[PDB]
Structures are given as structure tokens and as C-alpha cells.
Amino acid sequence: ELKVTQPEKSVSVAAGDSTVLNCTLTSLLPVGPIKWYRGVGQSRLLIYSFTGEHFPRVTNVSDATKRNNMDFSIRISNVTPEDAGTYYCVKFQKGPSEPDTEIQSGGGTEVYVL
Numbered sequence: 001e002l003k004v005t006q007p008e009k010s011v012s013v014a015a016g017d018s019t020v021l022n023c024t025l026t027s028l029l030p031v032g033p034i035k036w037y038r039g040v041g042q043s044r045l046l047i048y049s050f051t052g053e054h055f056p057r058v059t060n061v062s063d064a065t066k067r068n069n070m071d072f073s074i075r076i077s078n079v080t081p082e083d084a085g086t087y088y089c090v091k092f093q094k095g096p097s098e099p100d101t102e103i104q105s106g107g108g109t110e111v112y113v114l
Contacts, residue, residue, distance in 0.1 A: 006106035023089030
């Protein structure tokens, strides 16, 4: 079962402090990007992309850098008031052609800047 897990909570951070937003997956299949968004709607802002392999042209290449291969956490350094909002870690399938197709999402983590 593919699930994307983010902590269910609110982190409150002073402007200028940093925070890490956690996201883990139960599977790396099917292949495709994990992208982070802030906010709501079709114009949700893209924040960070774990793009990964050039699939399906390549099907056998993976990231060899992680402490844990199911982790997709991001660090927001020196948070600003503009960074307040709910962040979503979203899993896509990289199909034959673009755009990528969303298939799963975490439930969101709120950042409140004090």
C-alpha cells in the first residue's frame, strides 16, 4: 500500500529560525517525482522537487545519497513570514509523457511563523 506520511501538526517557528518538514513513503513504486507544495488550488506553489530518474526512458537508476531511501524531508532555512502555510508532500507517477500525474499525497504540515 503506497502511503505518504507527514506529521499531523503545526510547527510554530520564529522568523529567522529554520525547520525541517518530514515526509516518508511506504514504497518507491510506481516510479516518479515527489514534490512539495504550499497552499491550495490548481496554482498551489511548487516549493521543492525530488525528480529522480528519467523514467521510463531509464528504469534502473536511483538516488544513492539518502540516510533512508523512503525519506523526502526538506529544510526551510531562515523561515520568513511568507513561508507560513500548509505544506504537502505529493507523489507523482512519471508516465510516458509529461505532465506528471499525482497519485498520492501526505495530509499536510502547517508552518506558523510567530
